[PDB]
Design brief:
The structure is cut from a larger assembly and holds chains A, B, C, D and E. In chain B, 62% of the residues lie in helices and 0% in strands. Chain B has helices spanning 3-6, 9-30, 35-60, 64-67, 80-84, 88-91, 96-100. Chain C is an alpha+beta fold. Chain C has helices spanning 50-56, 66-74, and strands spanning 15-16, 26-27, 32-33. A 3-stranded antiparallel β-sheet of chain C has the order 1-2-3, with no helix packed on it. Chain C is elongated and about 75 Å long. Chain E contains 2 helices and 3 strands; from the N terminus they run βαββα. Chain E has helices spanning 9-19, 49-55, and strands spanning 2-3, 24-31, 37-43. Classes of the chains: A mainly alpha, B mainly alpha, C alpha+beta, D alpha+beta, E alpha+beta. At the A-E interface, helix 1 of A face loops of E. The complex binds magnesium ion (29 copies) and zinc ion. The site of one magnesium ion has 2 residues of chain A, from loops. One magnesium ion (MG) is lined by residues 8, 50 of chain A. Chain C binds 3 RNA strands through residues 10-28, 30-31, 34-67, 69-81. Chain D: GO terms for molecular function: RNA binding; structural constituent of ribosome. Chain D: Belongs to the universal ribosomal protein uL24 family.
RNA sequence: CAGACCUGAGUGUGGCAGGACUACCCGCCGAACUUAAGCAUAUUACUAAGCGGAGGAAAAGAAAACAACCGUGAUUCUCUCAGUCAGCGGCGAGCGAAGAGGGAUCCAACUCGUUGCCGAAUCGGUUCUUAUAGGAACUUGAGUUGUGGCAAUGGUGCAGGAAUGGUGAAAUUCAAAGCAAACCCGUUGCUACAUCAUGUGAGUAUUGAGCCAAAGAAGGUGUUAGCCCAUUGAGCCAUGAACCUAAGAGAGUAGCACUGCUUGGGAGUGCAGUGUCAAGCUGGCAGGUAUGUGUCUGCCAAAGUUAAAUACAGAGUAGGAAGACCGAUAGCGAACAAGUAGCGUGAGCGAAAGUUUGAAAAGCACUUUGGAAAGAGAGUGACAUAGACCUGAAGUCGUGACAAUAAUGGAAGUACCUCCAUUUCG
RNA sequence: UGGUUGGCGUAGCAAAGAUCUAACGGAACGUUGGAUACUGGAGCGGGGAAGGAUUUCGUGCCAACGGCACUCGUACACGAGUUGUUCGGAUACUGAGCACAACGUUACACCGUUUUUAGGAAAAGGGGCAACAGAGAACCUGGGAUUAUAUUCCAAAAAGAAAUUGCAUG
RNA sequence: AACGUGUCGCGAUGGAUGACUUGGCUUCCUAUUUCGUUGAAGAACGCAGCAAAGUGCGAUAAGUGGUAUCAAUUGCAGAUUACCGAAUCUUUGAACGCAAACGGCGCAUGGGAGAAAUCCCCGUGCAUGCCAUAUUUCUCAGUGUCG
């Protein structure tokens, strides 16, 4: 609903902008290991219960 | 950057605001390369500028009389223990008897043929 | 109806995030943390669970200052005048 | 000493360590001019590869790519599938400095070596 | 403007007055779902928001 | 009554405490599982968990110790004493030490109170000397309801060192597969495969010749490298502080009764509670069986500090050395963005994952079909049945060809096939 | 422990009545029109709490997922989006309650009372918290204002009209 | 015939194996080695030109400064590495001005902007307990003791 302490909004805000595909250019670095983001989250699956 | 230190207080402060005013404008441009180079020049001026104050409060509180009155951000932090520990000044103290009984029998050097 | 139909009966939260540990272990009704034991000053720590002592001990985080003071003890607290 | 330690100290070398650890032998004309044996590689010192497919191929050092332990040469390159030509890496111990790029610091490296 | 999230409205007025030299008849901020604060500052009619925004490199 | 003191507040001022860590260590707390072939005492165990606390160790320590000697001489530790002809114990299961002795460590000792002789000599603060000196002046401020002494350094200066770092050596990128069957002869002799079409990565390999070595010591480099690179030696080099040059002698104490725990400790090892409660004009405590008594021996408790030898049995910081260890279902849970994802209301639980293509990305441009994914060519590379991927098993499946007609199985033949062996030109 | 298997293209994917048509789109289910039903105001309606936390919106996408399919999606990617003197909350109520302090008890506070054998006023009974459904609570409409927010946005003829708090001003 | 069975050749699925190993485990050592109210450890939120995670850092934010070192970093773009003295170190947290699912609210002090003062931002102090002290000796309370 509407209610959120801003501290919770800052955290969902945190996880929200953290919920992004890895940059394309990061995969092109030497010795790179990363491909997909292993910490992609989906609201319908993992829950950030705050 | 040595030139950044020759500047006086306000000459720095005036030199600083023109960086922020120009760092901001790169941020405007960004929304639509020097921004790092600016951001670290602002950091240089705060470094030089925050140094003159600590270098001029160590100057205000120099001398034994005020050294106890010193702001403790300026007081020589060690570890909580190095500060609370007995100093050699009071550590090596020995009772007057001991002081005399160590003079009367000094650890005289010797060898045995 | 003790199964899936009573899972719908459960609506609240027992625990919100703690102000200290950041764990979702702050029992909102008994305003304390199940994890850190917060607001109690001394943090919760049991020897029957060292997997948890280990889990949240020093070095688990930034050791933000402790890195600075460790470097200093190693350098005899060498100092510029 | 031990292999994990020795072999880790290499693949986790600082760029500091990589420039020395990724040095090249001087060619005899220099190893006569200077009593130096091998000297760390740098941009713009001419070199000839002496091992691998590009054996015998002289060329200037376009870049010391220390993160890749290689040393791109102006002449040591190959066409990509798209036709863009790209430098091909080479390991400096495989080459021979034919003409090192002198200056004030580098001169001292020679004088103290 | 995205504006510092801890800043309040009166401070955003005083900041527009100083950064862009223009009065803000009002400044109703919101903090974005992302966590940035966002001010819609409306300029006084005496100040164009258009002449000023283009002066601003926009 | 003004004050004075005593008692107690309130602020100001200067400080500290609280948290973390807690492997080890100190104090308390305190199980049970287990064992006893049951089980209660016992055992597990004075352990785990629990609480509280330290430090780089801690605790212990300078005799109210042992012995019974030709006597030793703080503590800790260690080997042994000793799994004990000690001892405890349903005397069962079991438990179980100490003296001495060898050793480590150890130029290891001291301080109060008291007694006696003094009696503010003290302390704190202020100022001061380049100094919150172990200095000096000054202070009622504290302190005679007893500080302290007696007997029973600070300031400034130079250097060196050490220690860390900083630097720093040799020599091929030399030359181009074998046989001669101990070494010497011998630095010498002699020796294709799958008309067309491609195909052999890198030379640390082989050989031949040298070469360095106070360095052969392992790593890197496209193959196995003393000599391609890096490493270290000497020698130098720098540095912020630091580091090295007559009297007395402890009282709710010790003891004792009861209780309780505890211990090998046994008519009591230590302790605790409560009651009781000394002595110091044949003192007191120990002298491992109680009591009363007499000798003798060692000691002198009830206050304090104290390095080293020791612990680190799920710690840290900064480094280092290793291995008959594991080798990716192993080794830590974790070789990886691992205490991560994920899970649980929570306390908590908790993975899998080798980006090991290649020497290098040279990571398949371009053509072609396809809406695409993709496919067919082409290209790279030594190899792409090396294609984002070393190897590439089994099992399973697809396909081609082939033999064929409960399963498997054994024996023996025979039919057909055999990229198999051997033999024969026997 | 990993992988694989027969069963097996099987068992099923049968609760809530439903789609039809043309045109267009597309590489081939959507979109619009029409038709047809359904929900049937205790609604497959319109708003909220809890909860969720980007699901919102637009463009694109449809590899994977949406147990059939998708051209569509709550999926994927990219870019957007949430505006307040007056709404709610806090500032500022008390309540069942809770607990800091102190004090007490405990080998120990991580216990208890909740005032303290107690000098709690700093300019008679210490401090605090505890209700987004209780108490409190100054704002309304219109909009041609969005892709997405509005009792929040609108601009000088504020579309406008108010009320209200603080200070100050005649 | 078919299916099914079976052999063989290829191929797929699968991921064993072998080799590899910047990891673990164990042992040993060293030392000027042991956090915090001078704000610790932990937690949060942030900071890069493209940066989610991890790492680094803290509005001076993948760093400022000192030192050495050198010519790089390197996916692209654009013009470092190592160490350590000076700093910087956001919200918190023992957390301490009061609270707290509130990015809330104070009092005092100084600053700032600003403005017709009110508002608004900022810095510093402000928890409790205890010890010391009142050094120019603070103010007091008691039918405590006296005078
Ligand atoms: Mg669900
Ligand atoms: Mg929520
Ligand atoms: Mg139930
Ligand atoms: Mg219920
Ligand atoms: Mg708002
Ligand atoms: Mg503590
Ligand atoms: Mg039994
Ligand atoms: Mg324990
Ligand atoms: Mg001790
Ligand atoms: Mg002691
Ligand atoms: Mg002895
Ligand atoms: Mg026992
Ligand atoms: Mg005395
Ligand atoms: Mg007694
Ligand atoms: Mg016992
Ligand atoms: Mg005595
Ligand atoms: Mg493993
Ligand atoms: Mg393979
Ligand atoms: Mg069927
Ligand atoms: Mg109907
Ligand atoms: Mg949508
Ligand atoms: Mg999405
Ligand atoms: Mg009440
Ligand atoms: Mg309330
Ligand atoms: Mg209400
Ligand atoms: Mg309201
Ligand atoms: Mg809407
Ligand atoms: Mg990041
Ligand atoms: Mg607080
Ligand atoms: Zn918590």
């Amino acid at each position: 609903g509407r209610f959120k302490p801003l501290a919770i909004k800052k955290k969902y805000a945190k996880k929200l902008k953290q919920n992004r595909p890895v940059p394309y250019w990061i995969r092109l670095r030497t010795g790179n290991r990363i491909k997909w983001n292993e910490k992609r989250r989906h609201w319908r699956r993992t829950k950030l219960h705050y | 950057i040595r030139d950044l230190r020759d500047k006086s207080k306000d000459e720095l402060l005036k030199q600083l605001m023109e960086f922020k005013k120009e760092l901001s404008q790169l941020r405007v441009a960004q929304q639509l390369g020097r921004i790092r180079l600016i951001r670290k020049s602002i950091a240089r001026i705060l470094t030089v500028l925050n140094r003159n104050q600590r270098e001029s409060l160590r100057k205000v509180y120099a001398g034994r009389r005020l050294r106890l009155a010193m702001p403790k951000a300026l007081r020589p932090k060690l570890t909580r223990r190095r500060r609370l520990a007995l100093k050699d000044n009071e550590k090596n103290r020995k009772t007057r008897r001991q002081l005399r009984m160590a003079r009367k029998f000094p650890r005289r050097v010797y060898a045995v043929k | 109806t003790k199964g899936t139909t009573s899972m719908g009966q459960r609506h609240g939260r027992t625990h919100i995030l703690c102000r200290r540990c950041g764990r979702n272990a702050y029992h909102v009704q008994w305003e304390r943390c199940a994890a850190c034991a917060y607001p109690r000053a001394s943090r919760r720590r049991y020897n029957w669970s060292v997997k948890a002592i280990k889990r949240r001990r020093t070095g688990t985080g930034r050791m933000r200052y402790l890195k600075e003071v460790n470097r200093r003890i190693k350098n005899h607290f060498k100092t510029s005048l | 000493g031990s292999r994990r330690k020795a072999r880790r100290a290499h693949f986790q070398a600082p760029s500091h360590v990589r420039r020395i650890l990724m040095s090249a032998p001087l060619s005899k004309e220099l190893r006569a001019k200077y009593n130096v044996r091998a000297m760390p590689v740098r941009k713009d010192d001419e070199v000839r590869v002496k091992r691998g497919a590009y054996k015998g191929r002289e060329g200037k050092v376009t870049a010391c790519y220390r993160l890749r332990w290689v040393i791109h040469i102006d002449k040591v390159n190959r066409e990509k599938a798209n036709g863009t030509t790209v430098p091909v890496g080479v390991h400096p111990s495989n080459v021979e400095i034919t003409k090192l790029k002198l200056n004030h610091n580098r001169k001292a490296i020679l004088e103290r070596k | 403007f995205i504006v510092d999230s801890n800043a309040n409205k009166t401070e955003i007025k005083k900041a527009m007055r100083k950064l862009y030299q223009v009065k803000a008849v009002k400044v109703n901020t919101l903090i974005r779902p992302d966590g940035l604060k966002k001010a819609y500052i409306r300029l006084s009619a005496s100040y164009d928001a258009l002449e000023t925004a283009n002066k601003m490199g926009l």
